[PDB]
Amino acid sequence: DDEFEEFPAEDWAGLDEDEDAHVWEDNWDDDNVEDDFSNQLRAELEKH
Amino acid sequence: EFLHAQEEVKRIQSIPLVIGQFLEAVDQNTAIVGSTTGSNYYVRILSTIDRELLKPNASVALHKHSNALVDVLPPEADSSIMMLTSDQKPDVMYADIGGMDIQKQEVREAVELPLTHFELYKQIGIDPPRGVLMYGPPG
Amino acid sequence: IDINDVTPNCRVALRNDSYTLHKILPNKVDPLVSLMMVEKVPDSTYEMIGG
Amino acid sequence: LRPGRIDRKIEFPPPNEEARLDILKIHSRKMNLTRGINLRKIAELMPGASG
Amino acid sequence: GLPKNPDLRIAQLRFLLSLPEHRGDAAVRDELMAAVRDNNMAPYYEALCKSLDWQIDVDLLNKMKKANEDELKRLDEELEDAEKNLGESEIRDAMMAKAEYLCRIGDKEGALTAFRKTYDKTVALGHRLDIVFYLLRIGLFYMDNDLITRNTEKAKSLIEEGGDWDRRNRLKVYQGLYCVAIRDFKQAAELFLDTVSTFTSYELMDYKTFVTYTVYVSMIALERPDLREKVIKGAEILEVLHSLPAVRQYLFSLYECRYSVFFQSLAVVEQEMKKDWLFAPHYRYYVREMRIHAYSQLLESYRSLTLGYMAEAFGVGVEFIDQELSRFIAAGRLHCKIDKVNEIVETNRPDSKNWQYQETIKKGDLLLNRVQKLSRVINM
Amino acid sequence: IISTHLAKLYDNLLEQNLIRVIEPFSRVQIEHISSLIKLSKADVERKLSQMIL
């Protein structure tokens, strides 16, 4: 082993507990804040 | 020189050999073979022999005098011949038989259905039949 | 070869000219008894064998 | 059956209705059976059957 | 074929209340209150009030705690009587009754300890699997992921050791519900389809709801051939759907390429899934994936296409389809490019030989990395 | 019973007729195929899309 002592491990000062820790798949698009695709389709039908 | 030597050790494979039966492997370079003269022996295996082919109870050829395992014959020499299926094939069609639809279904299912499918046979917990016994009155 | 290894019912190899034991070849024990244990036999109980 | 050996003996008549249903359940446990399988109705439709 | 304990409709109602929109649902509140009154769940009522900032009806809770203590002391006395003289059987039944009432009232930790002790004493494999199922159902009710995983592994080990195929199929349904919970829709659909004809777990949900869940998971996990051979041509699924016009329309719109109706059905399914407690976490992922699936299905049979035609087919505007296609092409889901000066949707599906060459490069690079690391490590 | 199966027979014959009509072509027009098979352009296009799928 060649433990890289020169580079320190990130400090655990705060070390806040996991918010949700859900383990499904993450994925980027989940971050998006959409507007209720149902409402989107209703608006699309209304505006034709 | 090794390639030369391999070809020169085949003179131990002279034509008048004695067919035998390979029973068990002891050490490698040795084995126990059952000759057709009715006796077993603890004999040496020729180096050039491909040990992948020495399946249990596989036909082998032994030196006439030394009884050394010298060659591995094709899978079966055998005396119980197989149906020639070209001139010994019967001439009875399925149509030549009348009725017996249930019997035909069962027979052609127990020895062809396992050959087919098999992905339904375990799903329901029953095991495929090894054989079929046909019994009934005389004729 | 030590006689203590020449046990009853063991395969041996005898030489050609004069039968002289010179090896103790491997033997097939064939244990047919270690294949019928059913452990505690779970799911076999009076309640379900009712009657 | 000599004393000092296996002497006690227990008899087994042909199974009754409840015994037949239980044996059917036991032997049908390890099989893929569909919803609403009434092995009781099968036992009733199979009267006077043995193991 | 198992007790309705814990009643998962209680979890559904609690989730509905927790949802901001329906926290004022008078009818839902009355139904939950009636259930808790009948079942005498003092710990659960305390927890519900703590979570919802609701006033404590101490008048009811007083008699309710009285009844709970009466029943608990009865069970303890009966257990003591059992252990005094009776050998096994009766004592196990006593512990089972105690734990069952504790679960019915809502004491998570007391119920779990009681069931652990009962399991330790029990030796019948069927009863062990029943205990594991009770624990799995508690874990589903309280979404205790670690408990669910541990109990699933224990049940699998028991079935391996040997167990009834009825319990096997019940475990399949339980695993399917957990998979739906943790967003493993492929395995969820596989298990649900396998157990569509062998469904006996009415303790968890109704058969109609089970078939609806199977349909939903299948149309997202199964390709067109499998969806043809299993779901749409499934006799049992069709029989059940005959009484569910909405779900049948939702499935057949996608299958038959009636895209406007499919979008309407997905619109209603979005609200249904959001209200449902099991799907609520993944009520946007499913909708987005179904939209991607529909777009890909339409594009699979078109080298070139017109945004106007797509908008007409989907019953939407041109701008909406432009936004959706741009987003998905950027994310790398749909294989196509949008031409805007002339509104075309030219398809760009990759060539098989070239895709295979790229995959070979990538995988072989990983393998060669590993082989080089091993060779280096061998000497140092 | 014949009436029950007429719809399926019609679908199968439409499939095979489209295959036979479009066999000797590489960039045939949907309008031409519709004219050859005596069906509407929209119906022919939809059926061809389903067949490609």
Curated annotation (Swiss-Prot), chain A:
Function: Component of the 26S proteasome, a multiprotein complex involved in the ATP-dependent degradation of ubiquitinated proteins. This complex plays a key role in the maintenance of protein homeostasis by removing misfolded or damaged proteins, which could impair cellular functions, and by removing proteins whose functions are no longer required. Therefore, the proteasome participates in numerous cellular processes, including cell cycle progression, apoptosis, or DNA damage repair.
Protein name as it appears in the record: 26S proteasome complex subunit SEM1
Subcellular location: Nucleus
Entry comment describing in which tissues the protein is expressed: Expressed in limb bud, craniofacial primordia and skin.
Entire-sequence positions represented here: 16 to 63 of 70
Organism in which the protein naturally occurs: Homo sapiens
Assembly: Component of the 19S proteasome regulatory particle complex. The 26S proteasome consists of a 20S core particle (CP) and two 19S regulatory subunits (RP). The regulatory particle is made of a lid composed of 9 subunits including SEM1, a base containing 6 ATPases and few additional components. Belongs to the TREX-2 complex (transcription and export complex 2), composed of at least ENY2, GANP, PCID2, SEM1, and either centrin CETN2 or CETN3. Component of the homologous recombination repair (HR) complex composed of ERCC5/XPG, BRCA2, PALB2, DSS1 and RAD51. Interacts with the C-terminal of BRCA2.
The family this protein is said to belong to: Belongs to the DSS1/SEM1 family.
Domain of life of the source: Eukaryota
One Gene Ontology term, aspect cellular component: cytosol
Swiss-Prot record, chain C:
Modified residues (Phosphoserine): 18
Subunit comment: Component of the 19S proteasome regulatory particle complex. The 26S proteasome consists of a 20S core particle (CP) and two 19S regulatory subunits (RP). The regulatory particle is made of a lid composed of 9 subunits, a base containing 6 ATPases including PSMC5 and few additional components. Component of a complex with USP49 and RUVBL1. Interacts with PRPF19. Interacts with TRIM5. Interacts with NDC80. Interacts with PAAF1. Interacts, in vitro, with the thyroid hormone receptor (in a thyroid hormone T3-dependent manner) and with retinoid X receptor (RXR). Interacts with ERCC6.
Cystine pairs: none
Organism taxonomic ancestry: Eukaryota, Metazoa, Chordata, Craniata, Vertebrata
Described purpose of this protein according to its UniProt entry: Component of the 26S proteasome, a multiprotein complex involved in the ATP-dependent degradation of ubiquitinated proteins. This complex plays a key role in the maintenance of protein homeostasis by removing misfolded or damaged proteins, which could impair cellular functions, and by removing proteins whose functions are no longer required. Therefore, the proteasome participates in numerous cellular processes, including cell cycle progression, apoptosis, or DNA damage repair.
Subcellular location per the Swiss-Prot or TrEMBL entry: Cytoplasm; Nucleus
Protein name per the record: 26S proteasome regulatory subunit 8
Origin: domain of life: Eukaryota
Family membership: Belongs to the AAA ATPase family.
From Swiss-Prot, chain E:
Annotated disulfide bonds: none
GO biological process: proteasome-mediated ubiquitin-dependent protein catabolic process
InterPro entries cross-referenced by the UniProt entry: PCI_dom (IPR000717), Rpn7/CSN1 (IPR019585), Rpn7_N (IPR045135), RPN7_PSMD6_C (IPR049549), TPR-like_helical_dom_sf (IPR011990), WH_DNA-bd_sf (IPR036390)
Domain of life: Eukaryota
PROSITE patterns: PCI
GO CC terms of this entry: cytosol; extracellular region; ficolin-1-rich granule lumen; nucleoplasm; proteasome accessory complex; proteasome complex; proteasome regulatory particle; secretory granule lumen
Presence of keyword Transmembrane helix: no
Keywords from the named record: Proteasome
Residue ranges annotated for the PCI domain, each copy included: 184-352
SMART domains per record: PINT
Alphabetized PANTHER family for the sequence: 26S PROTEASOME NON-ATPASE REGULATORY SUBUNIT 6 (PTHR14145:SF1), 26S PROTESOME SUBUNIT 6 (PTHR14145)
Task performed by this protein: Component of the 26S proteasome, a multiprotein complex involved in the ATP-dependent degradation of ubiquitinated proteins. This complex plays a key role in the maintenance of protein homeostasis by removing misfolded or damaged proteins, which could impair cellular functions, and by removing proteins whose functions are no longer required. Therefore, the proteasome participates in numerous cellular processes, including cell cycle progression, apoptosis, or DNA damage repair.
Family in the record: Belongs to the proteasome subunit S10 family.
Protein name: 26S proteasome non-ATPase regulatory subunit 6
Organism: Homo sapiens
Gene: PSMD6
Curated annotation (Swiss-Prot), chain F:
Induction (record text): By FOXO4; expression in embryonic stem cells (ESCs) is mediated by FOXO4.
Subcellular localization: Nucleus; Cytoplasm, Cytosol
Record note on modification: Phosphorylated by AMPK.
Signal peptide extent: none
Tissue: Highly expressed in embryonic stem cells (ESCs). Expression decreases as ESCs differentiate.
Covalent S-S links between cysteines: none
Spans through the membrane: none
Stated role: Component of the 26S proteasome, a multiprotein complex involved in the ATP-dependent degradation of ubiquitinated proteins. This complex plays a key role in the maintenance of protein homeostasis by removing misfolded or damaged proteins, which could impair cellular functions, and by removing proteins whose functions are no longer required. Therefore, the proteasome participates in numerous cellular processes, including cell cycle progression, apoptosis, or DNA damage repair. In the complex, PSMD11 is required for proteasome assembly.
Known partners and oligomeric status: Component of the 19S proteasome regulatory particle complex. The 26S proteasome consists of a 20S core particle (CP) and two 19S regulatory subunits (RP). The regulatory particle is made of a lid composed of 9 subunits including PSMD11, a base containing 6 ATPases and few additional components.
Family, similarity comment: Belongs to the proteasome subunit S9 family.
Protein name in UniProt: 26S proteasome non-ATPase regulatory subunit 11
Organism: Homo sapiens (Human)
Residue span relative to the full protein: 318 to 370 of 422
